Amino acid sequence: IPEKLEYFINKYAEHSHDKWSMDKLANGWIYGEIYSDSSKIQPLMLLSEKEKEIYRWPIKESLKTMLAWDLHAMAEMMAENYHNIWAKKKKLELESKGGGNHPLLVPYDTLTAKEKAKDREKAQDIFKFLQISGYVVSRGXXXXXXXXXXXXXXXXXXXXXXXXXXX
């Protein structure tokens, strides 16, 4: 967790809270200590105390995973990690409680597109602020190098052919 990125974690959390505030004021929500859903009354204006930071908490984990591990790449790695953490939690809890089988207990190369879109939304949401902040990110001529490798292979093959034809 870099110090500059650690500083920007709070700012990004505030920006996400502001976006959610715009959404909830468009929907209609007013602050109130009483917890309710049909009365349209919440004390953090349905996001509760911990539910306000349920999405702020994994931003640091996302940064750590990015450091430990183009733009479409960051998108797909982030969505894959999103699905993997939830799948691990679900499999752990179902193994603990002896529950039923979840259709999402399958490798990410088999899921329905809506399931991938659901966390691709959050991936893009967290990556847009990183891009606007000037953070260049990579996964961590081309044809010319390919041709050079091919030429090296051809040289090896020619050497082999010469060694064979010499006999």
Describe the structure.
It is classed as membrane protein. By secondary structure, this protein is an all-alpha fold. The protein has helices spanning 3-27, 49-53, 58-68, 71-97, 113-132, 142-165, and strands at 30-31, 41-42. It has a two-stranded parallel ribbon with strand order 1-2. The termini are far apart.
Summarize the structure.
Helices cover 67% and strands 2% of the residues. The longest helix has 27 residues, at 71-97.
List descriptors.
two-stranded parallel ribbon, 2% strand, mainly alpha, 1 chains
- Shape category: elongated
Helix content: 55-70%
How many separate helices?
6
Described by strand count, sense and barrel closure, the largest sheet is: 2 strands, parallel
Number of strands: 2
Order of helices and strands: HEEHHHHH
Strand content: under 5%
What structural category characterises the helix and strand content?
mainly alpha
Distance between the termini: 63 Å
Organism: Mus musculus (Mouse)
Protein name: Ryanodine receptor 2
Family: Belongs to the ryanodine receptor (TC 1.A.3.1) family. RYR2 subfamily.
Sequence repeats: 70-140
